[PDB]
Design a protein around this ligand. Structure first.
Ligand SMILES: O=C(O)c1cc(O)c(O)c(O)c1
Ligand SMILES: [Fe+2]
Ligand SMILES: [Fe+2]
Lengths: 407, 405
């Protein structure tokens, strides 16, 4: 319910290839005014804004993909999975922001179970004591900055403005940290590959702390030019800085340009507000809940909200694979071998084994995986409907105008 | 540039099913198919070049990663597997150009999108398409599928679907090419297909909502999910997708057709609309729009050795980028090293895309249409560092290049 402040930090696979000297040591302590501040505050959760560099987001690619799931392992980036402990997520804070954001006409994606690559883990494993677990929980916002067109900077800034008061209206009194990673001036493709611009970096940083809104007119061009093509991903800093106070105070501001990137780092301390907010936090809580208010009075109905998807995820994911003609062939011949290899708990196993249709709907399975499972078992949709209504298929077809069957 | 009209239709898998079984003959399905004919033939006469196609996917191609407005930008689309194998239907061609133009306009109008390709279409798409268009090897037109995340709540507000169609019109209308575009809205009508409530319908609501959608759509925009699903069943609330297509037609439309059948779980319904032009020139011009639409990559052309990864690039790039993306699989990892020709002979890349890789032609891949992060994976897979890559991008040698600080 309260925002402690947000760190802007480069994410780079070189901070992770090596870490994991005359040239390194000066930036490792341009960093830790905030192993420090992440450890005296010890945030409950960190809203983490980053960019997947075409590892877990490619064939289907989103502009603002909120992470909603329980844990996040290291994405295998082509160099094997980096030995790190799975860091926890925060589904109910994830859910709550999704409700405020959609309510304020931001179109999200939601994702679960996919690796986090160096976009997240490289600066993390240097800001955070990651020896057996990580000191806080994570709400990853994966932005879509690589495949144009992409949201305008003003759209980034505004998302941040909404996100902030989405975190403020959260009913649990915890503290949250923001993190808009990425940047700064660099290009890593084309004949321009090596470009930098430190005359811009310094202006963008001083302006991004004391006057961000003068950055709201910047097109991709102005950005691509003043900082490299890939350096325009600092739209994600205008996101992060959006969710902080109007006025703030930089209690740190390091910067060093070694090999590939301008590696900078801005630490913000959240002041209070510019005034009370226009709409109260309960009236915001009211508005985020309006679309599904009193859905509880509908019976025999199990809304597939984020919380149900997280609870359902392992059995859902498992049953989703029936679309693979090879998975679904073992499912019929050697169901146990499939079970033993799964990561399905034992009631989940029983539910499928028993073909307990109504039980899966209660438990969290979404119908359309059962549609698939029915079809794989050569029993139609109708038998599932019948079994939902505790009726025999003939007693159920009596309730329809005609008796058709289908797969 | 020309929007001719728009139709609405259920995408029940029964339609697909009754088709493949060829039941244009039996008591039950015979009148239902006859309800599709007015849309069928309107399509066969108007001959649109593109159907922009609003549908929903049913946890097939969209599960572990799940977006609201997901624009198919790719070049062609095959039927998905739903646990029983792909149906027997030709792929259907896409329209990456118009997809790219629309993408452009919609982001300008502050719609956060997703782009996707390579992925099958499930009964959401091919169930009514199989019955509305002829297809013994060859669909009569192209499509731009818009896949809507209507299943995992919260989803966009009803007014946000409407508003989408509203920008979608101006975008489509502003496309600098003389083509006929039709607009499809699929899903519904009343039905609920999970839980103890399964079997629910409401014919009264279906009829109130279709006439309202037709003759007074803005009256629906305040509708919440709880309204829609109390009135129309849980999965019947997917009719916000009819709002969206209605959103991209004229304020007034000629409703040429309407049919209703309720054989089983689903109210199988259809509406054909004829577009009636704009009865007053709009508050932003076709040229003013296009300007505002490339606005942010305006003058990008003048930047040396910069190759933006726009959607035309991504579509050009897709087969090689997909091949180079599989290097995160540890099995694909090592065949790429132990038997590259075996991996090449099994792939679907042109011979040129193969050579560009065999050569490790770093800078020739960047201009072919390969994104750098796909090479960043390729370099570290094969032993090469990124150090030589950046240099090759400039023509410099590994030791000459490092001259920087
Ligand atoms: O059983 C049906 O009539 C039905 C099944 C579906 O999977 C579906 O998406 C639908 O709209 C209707
Ligand atoms: Fe990045
Ligand atoms: Fe549907």
């Amino acid at each position: 319910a309260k925002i402690i402040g947000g760190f802007a930090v480069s994410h780079t696979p070189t901070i992770a290839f090596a870490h994991d000297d005359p040239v390194w040591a000066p930036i490792f302590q341009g960093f830790e005014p905030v192993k420090q501040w992440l450890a005296e505050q010890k945030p409950d959760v960190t809203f983490y804004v980053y960019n997947d560099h075409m590892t877990s987001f490619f064939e289907h690619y989103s502009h603002f993909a909120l992470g909603v799931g329980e844990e996040y392992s290291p994405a295998d980036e082509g160099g094997g999975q980096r030995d790190l402990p799975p860091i926890k997520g925060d589904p109910e804070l994830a859910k709550h922001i999704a409700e405020c954001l959609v309510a304020d006409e931001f179109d999200l994606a939601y994702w679960q179970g996919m690796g986090l690559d160096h976009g997240a883990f490289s600066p993390l494993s240097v800001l955070l004591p990651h020896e057996h677990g990580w000191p806080c929980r994570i709400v990853p916002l994966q932005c879509g900055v690589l495949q144009h067109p992409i949201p305008k900077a003003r759209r980034f800034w505004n998302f941040g403005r909404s996100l902030r008061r989405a975190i403020q209206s959260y009913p649990r009194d915890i503290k949250v940290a923001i993190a808009g990673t990425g940047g700064l001036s660099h290009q890593v493709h084309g004949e321009r590959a090596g470009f930098n611009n430190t005359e811009w970096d310094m202006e963008f940083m001083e302006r991004l702390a004391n006057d961000p809104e003068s950055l709201l007119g910047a097109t991709v061009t102005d950005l691509a030019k003043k900082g490299g093509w890939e350096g325009a991903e600092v739209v994600m800093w205008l996101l992060m800085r959006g969710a902080l106070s109007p006025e703030v105070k930089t209690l740190h501001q390091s910067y060093f340009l070694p090999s590939m990137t301008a590696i900078a780092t801005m630490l913000f301390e959240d002041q209070g507000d510019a005034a009370p907010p226009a709409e109260s936090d309960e009236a915001l809580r009211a508005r985020a809940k309006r679309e599904l208010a009193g859905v509880e009075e509908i019976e025999g109905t199990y809304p597939f909200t984020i919380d149900r998807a997280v609870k359902g995820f392992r059995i859902n994911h498992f049953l989703h694979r029936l679309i693979e003609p090879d998975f679904r062939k073992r499912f019929v011949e050697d169901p146990e071998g499939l079970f033993a290899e799964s990561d399905l708990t034992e009631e989940e196993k029983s539910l499928i084994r028993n073909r307990d249709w109504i039980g899966m709907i209660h438990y969290g399975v979404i119908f359309f995986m059962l549609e698939k499972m029915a079809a794989v078992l050569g029993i139609g949709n109708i038998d599932v409907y019948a079994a939902f209504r505790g009726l025999s298929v003939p007693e159920f077809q009596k309730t329809r105008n005609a008796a058709i069957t289908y797969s």
